[PDB]
Design an enzyme around this catalytic site. Structure first.
Site, PDB file in Angstrom:
ATOM      1  N   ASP A   1      31.740 -86.194  50.077  1.00 58.52           N
ATOM      2  CA  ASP A   1      30.837 -86.275  51.210  1.00 58.52           C
ATOM      3  C   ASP A   1      29.998 -84.984  51.285  1.00 58.52           C
ATOM      4  O   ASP A   1      30.497 -83.970  51.750  1.00 58.52           O
ATOM      5  CB  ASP A   1      31.638 -86.472  52.507  1.00 58.52           C
ATOM      6  CG  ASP A   1      30.797 -86.434  53.766  1.00 58.52           C
ATOM      7  OD1 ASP A   1      29.550 -86.486  53.651  1.00 58.52           O
ATOM      8  OD2 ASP A   1      31.380 -86.324  54.872  1.00 58.52           O
TER       9      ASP A   1
ATOM     10  N   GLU B   1      29.664 -55.526  40.568  1.00 54.99           N
ATOM     11  CA  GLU B   1      30.844 -54.729  40.930  1.00 54.99           C
ATOM     12  C   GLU B   1      31.216 -55.014  42.374  1.00 54.99           C
ATOM     13  O   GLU B   1      30.941 -54.203  43.243  1.00 54.99           O
ATOM     14  CB  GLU B   1      30.550 -53.239  40.723  1.00 54.99           C
ATOM     15  CG  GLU B   1      29.915 -52.950  39.373  1.00 54.99           C
ATOM     16  CD  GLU B   1      29.663 -51.488  39.088  1.00 54.99           C
ATOM     17  OE1 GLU B   1      28.806 -50.866  39.766  1.00 54.99           O
ATOM     18  OE2 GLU B   1      30.316 -50.973  38.152  1.00 54.99           O
TER      19      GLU B   1
ATOM     20  N   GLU C   1      33.065 -54.726  45.423  1.00 57.93           N
ATOM     21  CA  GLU C   1      34.104 -53.901  46.050  1.00 57.93           C
ATOM     22  C   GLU C   1      34.734 -54.686  47.184  1.00 57.93           C
ATOM     23  O   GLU C   1      34.139 -55.648  47.674  1.00 57.93           O
ATOM     24  CB  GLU C   1      33.524 -52.579  46.566  1.00 57.93           C
ATOM     25  CG  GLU C   1      32.834 -51.765  45.479  1.00 57.93           C
ATOM     26  CD  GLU C   1      32.081 -50.537  45.955  1.00 57.93           C
ATOM     27  OE1 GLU C   1      31.590 -50.543  47.102  1.00 57.93           O
ATOM     28  OE2 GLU C   1      31.981 -49.560  45.178  1.00 57.93           O
TER      29      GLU C   1
ATOM     30  N   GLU D   1      38.622 -46.921  45.660  1.00 63.03           N
ATOM     31  CA  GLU D   1      37.231 -46.593  45.967  1.00 63.03           C
ATOM     32  C   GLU D   1      37.168 -45.553  47.088  1.00 63.03           C
ATOM     33  O   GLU D   1      38.196 -44.979  47.467  1.00 63.03           O
ATOM     34  CB  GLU D   1      36.431 -47.875  46.290  1.00 63.03           C
ATOM     35  CG  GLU D   1      35.507 -48.291  45.164  1.00 63.03           C
ATOM     36  CD  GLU D   1      34.415 -47.276  44.904  1.00 63.03           C
ATOM     37  OE1 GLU D   1      33.960 -46.631  45.877  1.00 63.03           O
ATOM     38  OE2 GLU D   1      34.017 -47.128  43.727  1.00 63.03           O
TER      39      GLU D   1
ATOM     40  N   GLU E   1      38.175 -51.249  43.580  1.00 61.43           N
ATOM     41  CA  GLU E   1      37.204 -51.792  42.646  1.00 61.43           C
ATOM     42  C   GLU E   1      37.904 -52.210  41.374  1.00 61.43           C
ATOM     43  O   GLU E   1      38.765 -51.481  40.887  1.00 61.43           O
ATOM     44  CB  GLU E   1      36.124 -50.745  42.325  1.00 61.43           C
ATOM     45  CG  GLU E   1      34.939 -51.339  41.593  1.00 61.43           C
ATOM     46  CD  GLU E   1      33.730 -50.445  41.380  1.00 61.43           C
ATOM     47  OE1 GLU E   1      33.480 -49.535  42.202  1.00 61.43           O
ATOM     48  OE2 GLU E   1      32.993 -50.700  40.398  1.00 61.43           O
TER      49      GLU E   1
ATOM     50  N   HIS F   1      26.915 -53.855  43.435  1.00 58.53           N
ATOM     51  CA  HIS F   1      25.819 -53.385  42.579  1.00 58.53           C
ATOM     52  C   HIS F   1      25.698 -54.317  41.392  1.00 58.53           C
ATOM     53  O   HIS F   1      26.720 -54.723  40.837  1.00 58.53           O
ATOM     54  CB  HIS F   1      26.103 -51.972  42.065  1.00 58.53           C
ATOM     55  CG  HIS F   1      26.389 -50.973  43.125  1.00 58.53           C
ATOM     56  ND1 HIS F   1      27.071 -49.802  42.848  1.00 58.53           N
ATOM     57  CD2 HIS F   1      26.077 -50.999  44.441  1.00 58.53           C
ATOM     58  CE1 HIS F   1      27.153 -49.150  43.998  1.00 58.53           C
ATOM     59  NE2 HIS F   1      26.566 -49.831  44.987  1.00 58.53           N
TER      60      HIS F   1
ATOM     61  N   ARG G   1      22.179 -41.826  42.517  1.00 61.32           N
ATOM     62  CA  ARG G   1      22.675 -42.886  43.360  1.00 61.32           C
ATOM     63  C   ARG G   1      22.037 -42.889  44.750  1.00 61.32           C
ATOM     64  O   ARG G   1      22.582 -43.533  45.651  1.00 61.32           O
ATOM     65  CB  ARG G   1      24.212 -42.820  43.424  1.00 61.32           C
ATOM     66  CG  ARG G   1      24.868 -43.066  42.068  1.00 61.32           C
ATOM     67  CD  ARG G   1      26.356 -42.761  42.075  1.00 61.32           C
ATOM     68  NE  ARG G   1      27.066 -43.491  41.017  1.00 61.32           N
ATOM     69  CZ  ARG G   1      27.063 -43.154  39.727  1.00 61.32           C
ATOM     70  NH1 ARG G   1      26.410 -42.071  39.321  1.00 61.32           N
ATOM     71  NH2 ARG G   1      27.714 -43.897  38.834  1.00 61.32           N
TER      72      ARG G   1
ATOM     73  N   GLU H   1      20.619 -50.818  37.502  1.00 59.78           N
ATOM     74  CA  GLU H   1      21.594 -51.144  38.529  1.00 59.78           C
ATOM     75  C   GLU H   1      20.869 -51.319  39.850  1.00 59.78           C
ATOM     76  O   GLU H   1      20.350 -50.325  40.389  1.00 59.78           O
ATOM     77  CB  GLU H   1      22.631 -50.013  38.666  1.00 59.78           C
ATOM     78  CG  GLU H   1      23.758 -50.299  39.653  1.00 59.78           C
ATOM     79  CD  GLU H   1      24.583 -49.078  40.028  1.00 59.78           C
ATOM     80  OE1 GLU H   1      25.829 -49.162  40.031  1.00 59.78           O
ATOM     81  OE2 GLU H   1      23.981 -48.032  40.347  1.00 59.78           O
TER      82      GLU H   1
ATOM     83  N   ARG I   1      21.274 -51.632  43.456  1.00 63.70           N
ATOM     84  CA  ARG I   1      22.373 -51.185  44.303  1.00 63.70           C
ATOM     85  C   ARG I   1      22.450 -51.842  45.675  1.00 63.70           C
ATOM     86  O   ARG I   1      23.505 -51.759  46.327  1.00 63.70           O
ATOM     87  CB  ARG I   1      22.326 -49.658  44.453  1.00 63.70           C
ATOM     88  CG  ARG I   1      22.443 -48.901  43.126  1.00 63.70           C
ATOM     89  CD  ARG I   1      22.294 -47.399  43.304  1.00 63.70           C
ATOM     90  NE  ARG I   1      23.333 -46.832  44.161  1.00 63.70           N
ATOM     91  CZ  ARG I   1      24.579 -46.545  43.756  1.00 63.70           C
ATOM     92  NH1 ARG I   1      24.942 -46.747  42.489  1.00 63.70           N
ATOM     93  NH2 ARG I   1      25.465 -46.037  44.614  1.00 63.70           N
TER      94      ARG I   1
HETATM   95  N1  LIG Z   1      23.455 -53.976  28.798  1.00 59.37           N
HETATM   96  C1  LIG Z   1      24.044 -54.363  29.949  1.00 59.37           C
HETATM   97  N2  LIG Z   1      23.460 -55.281  30.745  1.00 59.37           N
HETATM   98  C2  LIG Z   1      24.027 -55.686  31.893  1.00 59.37           C
HETATM   99  N3  LIG Z   1      25.200 -55.223  32.344  1.00 59.37           N
HETATM  100  C3  LIG Z   1      25.892 -54.297  31.646  1.00 59.37           C
HETATM  101  C4  LIG Z   1      25.345 -53.804  30.383  1.00 59.37           C
HETATM  102  N4  LIG Z   1      26.229 -52.910  29.914  1.00 59.37           N
HETATM  103  C5  LIG Z   1      27.251 -52.834  30.797  1.00 59.37           C
HETATM  104  N5  LIG Z   1      27.046 -53.662  31.830  1.00 59.37           N
HETATM  105  C6  LIG Z   1      27.927 -53.882  32.999  1.00 59.37           C
HETATM  106  O1  LIG Z   1      27.608 -53.013  34.081  1.00 59.37           O
HETATM  107  C7  LIG Z   1      28.760 -52.895  34.914  1.00 59.37           C
HETATM  108  C8  LIG Z   1      28.970 -51.432  35.264  1.00 59.37           C
HETATM  109  O2  LIG Z   1      30.061 -50.892  34.533  1.00 59.37           O
HETATM  110  P1  LIG Z   1      30.335 -49.318  34.549  1.00 59.37           P
HETATM  111  O3  LIG Z   1      31.305 -49.019  35.659  1.00 59.37           O
HETATM  112  O4  LIG Z   1      30.891 -48.921  33.211  1.00 59.37           O
HETATM  113  O5  LIG Z   1      28.947 -48.541  34.768  1.00 59.37           O
HETATM  114  P2  LIG Z   1      28.710 -47.483  35.948  1.00 59.37           P
HETATM  115  O6  LIG Z   1      27.305 -46.966  35.841  1.00 59.37           O
HETATM  116  O7  LIG Z   1      29.689 -46.351  35.821  1.00 59.37           O
HETATM  117  O8  LIG Z   1      28.866 -48.227  37.362  1.00 59.37           O
HETATM  118  P3  LIG Z   1      29.498 -47.536  38.666  1.00 59.37           P
HETATM  119  O9  LIG Z   1      29.577 -46.048  38.473  1.00 59.37           O
HETATM  120  O10 LIG Z   1      28.610 -47.837  39.840  1.00 59.37           O
HETATM  121  O11 LIG Z   1      30.880 -48.080  38.898  1.00 59.37           O
HETATM  122  C9  LIG Z   1      29.921 -53.492  34.133  1.00 59.37           C
HETATM  123  O12 LIG Z   1      30.187 -54.795  34.649  1.00 59.37           O
HETATM  124  C10 LIG Z   1      29.391 -53.611  32.724  1.00 59.37           C
HETATM  125  O13 LIG Z   1      30.018 -54.679  32.019  1.00 59.37           O
END
Ligand SMILES: Nc1ncnc2c1ncn2[C@@H]1O[C@H](COP(=O)(O)OP(=O)(O)OP(=O)(O)O)[C@@H](O)[C@H]1O
Ligand SMILES: Nc1ncnc2c1ncn2[C@@H]1O[C@H](COP(=O)(O)OP(=O)(O)OP(=O)(O)O)[C@@H](O)[C@H]1O
Ligand SMILES: O=C(O)CCC(=O)C(=O)O
Ligand SMILES: O=C(O)CCC(=O)C(=O)O
Ligand SMILES: [Mg+2]
Lengths: 447, 447, 224
Positions: free
Chosen positions: B57, B136, B138, B193, B200, B249, B320, B337, B339
Site C-alpha cells: 500500500d 561519514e 556521525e 568523535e 564515527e 561529510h 575545515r 569533501e 561538509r
Molecule cells: N577518490 C575518492 N572519491 C570519493 N571518496 C573517496 C575517495 N577516496 C576516499 N574516499 C572516501 O572519503 C571518505 C573519507 O575518508 P578519510 O577519513 O580517510 O578522509 P578524511 O579527509 O580524513 O575525512 P575526515 O578527516 O573528515 O574524517 C572515506 O569514506 C573514503 O572511502
C-alpha cells in the site's frame, strides 16, 4: 620489529584491530582503530597503512594545529607493537604507537614524542650517550562514598607494604602485573603505598623513548584494569587532603659509549664527575623543570613549599627529604632519583626537559653543591636560607613564569610546544583562579 | 545468474526470511518480510517473488501515492542481497533492497532510489562518467539520565580519538564493525568523535547508488547494535546544545572513462579543470542543496550561520572552516569533501542534488573562485562580504525557499519528489514555528 | 504582586501554552485635534472621518515594522503567527475581529481604532511612539485607506487574500527586526540610540533562541 614480523604476528594470532596511538601536548593518549580484513587483501591493506600511515584532524587534538591547516598524519613506529590484554583474545586488538607528521612528510614540530626523539638523537650524535629512565607512577584506587554516590573515596584503609585483608588490592595489582607482562613490560615489584587506597607497580628502566611509551601504556592499563574490578584508578597528584599524594619519581642515568658513566669506583660517594655535572644541571633548572614535570594546579598541593615534599633544591644520598635522592645501589645501578615529578606530566616532555637540563650541567661542567645528609624537613627556613637551599615554585603560575624565562628548556621543547603549553596552562590557571572554591565558601560565607 | 546465486545461497545457508526493503521520501527504511518455504516448491515461490516482486500500500508510505491509487510494487535489486547480522544465524534473515514500481510495471516517479539511478544513468550515457561518494555519518550513543529517566544524555564523557576507559564504546564500535563487515561493507576506521558519547565508523567510498544503500543499512546497523548494548544511537544533527553536532561529510569525485578526472598532476593544487568546474557547481547551488542535505529544523542548530559551522560558501585545501574541503590526498584519492550534510538526509536525494549541481558546473564550465586558505571563522562579517563569502540559509524554511527557486534541483528530483518534499517540510516547519518551546518558557514566563 | 499574595503567579508572556489563546494587548487609540474627537464624522461613511482613514492608512502602511516594537519577543510570533487565526492580516474592518485593525461599533467620543497586533511584552512608551508616528505619517501625507474587509479573513484562501492585497505581518522576531531596520519613519521616531540598541539587543536574543536545541526538536528528531 619490521612490517613483515608485525604482519606475521597479526596473521597467526588472529589480530582483528590495530590501534594507531599517539599523545596530545598534555600526554593524553589518542587513537583511531583500523579493522584488519581477512586474507591476503587484508594483509596488503594493513601493510600499506603500517608503512604509509593515515590521516587525521590535527585541529581536534590539543596543542597541535589550527582548523585552516588541520590535515595531519600518523607514522607507525613498528617496534612499539603490542596486543591489548584487556581487549578480547579471539579477534584481538593490537596497537602501534605513532609519530605525528605533516602532510608534507615531515615530523610535526608540536609532537611531544618527536620532541623526545630529537633530543635523544642529538645526545647520541654529540656524546654517543644513551638516556635511561625508571619512573614510578603511583596511583589511587577509588570507590564510591557509600554516604554520597557522587563522591569517590580511597578503595581501602591500608598503608605502606600492608598485607591483606587491610590491603584489599592483591587481585587488582595481580591483574595489572599480568597485563603489563602481556604488553612487554618487565615488572619489578608491586605493593600498597603509604596512603589509603594508594599503590605502586614498578617496571624496569629503559631508554627515555621506550620508557615514555610505557608510562602512557601503564596509565591506560591501570585505569582499564581497575574499571574491570568495579573501581576507578586516578593518577591525580593529590586527590585527598591529609594523606600522601602520588608522585612519579624519575630514576635516571646517562651511559656514554655503553658504560654507566654515573659510577666511579674511586670517587667520593662512588659518583662520577659526569654524575655531579648532571645533578648540578637538574638543580640549576629545577624551578623551571617543574612547570613540565608538575603541570597541574593540583600538582602544587603535593609539591607544596613549606611542608614535607620534594621541594627543597638540594641532592642527598639515601635521603628522601631533598628534590634529588641518590639510591645506595652502585655499578650499573648507579643513578639519580628526581623526586619532584607526578604522574599528571607528559612523560615525553618531562624526559626532554630533565635531559636538556642535565646535559646543560654536563656540557658546562657545572659544580654540584655538597650533598645534604640532614633531614631537610627538620631545618628552619633561616637555616635553609644560610645553606642556600631554595624551593621550587609554590604554584602552577609561578612555575610557568620560571619556564618562560628558561632558554635551555624553551630550546629543548621548541617554539610550538613551549608556546602552546604556556597558553593552555595559563588558561587552566585563569580558570582555577577565577573559580569560587569550597574552601572559600566554608571559610567566608559566615562573614 | 545473480538470481541463481541468491537461490543457491538461500538453499545452502538455511535462509528463512527475505526482507524486501526500500525507503520513503525522508529516507526512512521500510520493509515487508517474506517467509521462505522448504524444498524446491519454496525455492520456486521465492524465485517468483524475487523476479516479479510484490505488492504493498503506497498510501501508507510518506511521499508516495494517495489512497485512491494506492496499489504499488517492489522490484528487488539482487546485487543488494545480504544476511542481517543482528538476526538469528539458524534460519537466518536476508534482505534485498527494492526499486518502487507502479502496477503498470513502470518505475515510480516518487521513488528516491530510482531518482538517483536515473541521474546516474544519464551521467553515464552523456559523459561515460561514474559518481563516487564516501559519506561519514556521525552519531551519538545515549543512555538515560540517572536523575530523570525520561531524558537521554551522552553515553560517556570522552572526546576525539580518546582511549578507554574515558572512551566507553570500543565494545559497541567493535560489534558495529563486525556487523558492517558481515553486511559486505569495507570498513576503514572507527573512533570516538569530538563530543561526549559521539562516534564515527568510516567505510570505503563506492558508486553513489551502492553508497546510498550502505548509508541506509549503516544507520539501521548502528541503531540495532546500540540497542543490543542497552544504549540508544541517534543520527539527530544536533541533539545537545554546547557540544558538536553530527555531520555526514560527503567525499565525492567523478571518474570519466575509468580515470580519476579530479586529479591533474600539472595543474594548480594538482586539481583538474573538471574538479574546479564541479566545485563551482556545488558552490553555485549550495543554498538550495542544503534543503535536501540538511532537511530538518534541527539541522540548522549545527548548520548555523554566524558560528563555527560548514556554512561559508567557499572551498579550501586541508581547511575545515569552508563548506568544501579538498583533502591533501591526491591521485585516485583526489576528491572534494562537501561538509554541510548531516545524517538526517535521504542519501538517495542528497547524492542526486550534489551530482546535478556539480554537473551543472561541468556542463557549463563554471569558474571556481579562489580557495580561501585563511580560517574563515576568524574573519569579520564585512571581511567575508568583501571577499564574496556568502552563507547557506539560516533555517529549514529559508532553505526550502531556496530549493523552490532552483530549476537544476527541481529537474533532478522531478515534480513528484520535489513537490511532496516541499509540502511535507512546510508542514514540519509550521509545526515547529507554532509550538511553544522550553527556551521561550525559560526566557519569558517571568514577564 | 497581587497574584503572588494569592499564592499564584501572573505572566504577561504572549503565548505561554500551545493549544490555547495567547495574551494580547490591543491598543484602542484616537487623536483629538483642538479638543474634538477628530476620528468621528457624523456625515461620513461608517461615521469615520478622513483623518481616521488617513491614520488607519499610516498604521497599515508601517504594520510590518511596527510589530518589531509592539511584538518584541520570540514568543510573540507564537500568538502573532501568519497562516493561522491571529491579528496578522494587514487590513481594517468594522466590528470584525479577524483583521489587524478593528473599528469598534461605538461612535461620538467613543470613535477609535483597535490595533490588535500588540502583546503585553512590548515597552508601551516605544509601542505608543511608533503607532503615533506611523498614524501621523498617514495624516501628514493624507494616505488613502483601503476598503474595509467585512468578511471573516480567516475563512479566505491565501490566493484570495493575495488578490485582495491582504498581506501578513512578519512571521518571526528576526523578520520583524529586518522590517524595522528598513523603516525610516519608525527609526526617526525612536531615534538613533533606542533604535540601534533595540536592534542589537533583539538580534542577540534571536541568536540565543536560534542556536538553542528545543524540546520540540528532541521529541521530533531523537529517533532518527
Ligand atoms: N577518490 C575518492 N572519491 C570519493 N571518496 C573517496 C575517495 N577516496 C576516499 N574516499 C572516501 O572519503 C571518505 C573519507 O575518508 P578519510 O577519513 O580517510 O578522509 P578524511 O579527509 O580524513 O575525512 P575526515 O578527516 O573528515 O574524517 C572515506 O569514506 C573514503 O572511502
Ligand atoms: N642505572 C639506572 N638508571 C636508571 N634507572 C634505573 C637504573 N637502575 C634501576 N633503575 C630504575 O629505578 C627505578 C626504581 O627502582 P627501585 O624501586 O628498585 O629503587 P628504590 O630506591 O626502591 O626507589 P623507591 O623507594 O622510590 O621505590 C626502577 O624503575 C628501576 O628499573
Ligand atoms: O599483590 C600484588 O602486589 C601482586 C599480586 C600478588 O602478589 C598476588 O596475587 O597475591
Ligand atoms: O574501538 C573501535 O573503534 C573498534 C573496536 C576495537 O578497536 C576494539 O575491539 O578494541
Ligand atoms: Mg618501590
Amino acid at each position: 620489529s619490521t612490517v613483515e614480523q608485525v604482519l606475521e604476528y597479526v596473521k597467526s594470532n588472529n589480530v582483528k584491530f590495530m590501534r594507531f596511538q599517539f599523545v596530545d601536548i598534555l600526554g593524553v593518549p589518542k587513537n583511531v582503530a583500523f579493522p584488519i580484513k581477512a586474507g591476503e587483501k587484508g594483509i596488503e591493506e594493513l601493510r600499506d597503512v603500517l608503512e604509509n600511515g593515515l590521516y587525521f584532524d590535527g585541529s581536534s587534538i590539543e596543542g597541535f594545529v589550527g582548523i585552516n591547516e588541520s590535515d595531519m598524519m600518523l607514522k607507525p613506529d613498528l617496534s612499539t607493537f603490542s596486543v591489548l590484554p584487556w581487549r578480547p583474545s579471539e579477534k584481538s586488538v593490537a596497537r602501534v604507537i605513532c609519530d605525528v607528521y605533516t602532510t608534507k612528510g615531515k615530523p610535526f614540530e608540536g609532537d611531544p614524542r618527536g620532541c623526545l626523539k630529537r633530543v635523544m638523537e642529538e645526545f647520541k650524535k654529540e656524546f654517543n650517550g644513551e638516556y635511561f629512565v625508571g619512573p614510578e607512577p603511583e596511583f589511587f584506587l577509588l570507590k564510591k562514598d557509600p554516604h554520597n554516590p557522587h563522591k569517590y573515596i580511597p578503595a581501602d584503609d591500608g598503608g605502606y607494604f600492608d598485607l591483606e585483608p587491610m590491603d584489599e588490592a592483591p587481585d587488582i595489582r595481580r591483574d595489572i602485573v599480568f597485563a603489563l607482562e602481556n604488553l612487554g613490560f618487565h615488572v619489578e615489584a608491586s605493593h600498597h603505598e603509604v596512603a589509603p587506597g594508594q599503590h605502586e607497580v614498578d617496571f624496569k628502566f629503559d631508554d627515555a623513548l621506550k620508557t615514555a611509551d610505557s608510562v602512557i601504556t601503564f596509565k591506560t592499563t591501570i585505569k582499564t584494569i581497575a574499571e574491570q574490578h568495579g573501581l576507578k584508578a586516578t593518577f591525580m597528584p593529590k586527590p585527598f587532603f591529609g594523606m600522601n599524594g602520588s608522585g612519579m619519581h624519575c630514576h635516571q642515568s646517562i651511559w656514554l659509549n655503553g658504560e654507566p658513566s654515573f659510577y666511579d669506583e674511586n670517587a667520593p660517594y662512588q659518583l662520577s664527575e659526569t654524575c655531579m655535572n648532571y645533578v648540578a644541571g637538574i638543580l640549576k633548572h629545577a624551578k623551571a623543570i617543574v612547570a613540565i614535570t608538575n603541570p597541574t594546579v593540583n600538582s602544587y598541593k603535593r609539591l607544596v613549599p613549606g611542608y614535607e615534599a620534594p621541594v627543597n633544591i638540594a641532592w642527598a644520598n639515601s635521603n628522601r627529604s631533598a628534590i634529588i635522592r641518590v639510591p645506595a645501589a652502585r655499578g650499573k645501578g648507579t643513578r639519580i632519583e628526581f623526586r619532584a615529578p607526578d604522574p599528571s606530566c607528559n612523560p615525553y616532555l618531562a624526559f626532554t626537559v630533565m635531559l636538556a637540563a642535565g646535559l646543560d650541567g654536563v656540557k658546562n661542567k657545572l659544580d654540584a653543591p655538597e650533598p645534604v645528609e640532614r633531614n631537610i624537613f627538620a631545618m628552619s627556613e633561616a637555616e635553609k636560607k644560610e645553606l642556600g637551599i631554595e624551593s621550587v615554585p609554590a604554584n602552577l603560575k609561578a612555575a610557568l613564569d620560571e619556564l618562560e624565562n628558561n632558554d635551555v628548556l624553551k630550546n629543548a621543547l621548541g617554539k610550538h610546544i613551549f608556546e602552546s603549553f604556556l597558553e593552555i596552562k595559563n588558561a587552566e590557571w585563569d580558570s582555577f583562579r577565577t573559580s569560587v572554591t569550597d574552601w572559600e565558601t566554608t571559610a567566608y560565607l559566615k562573614i
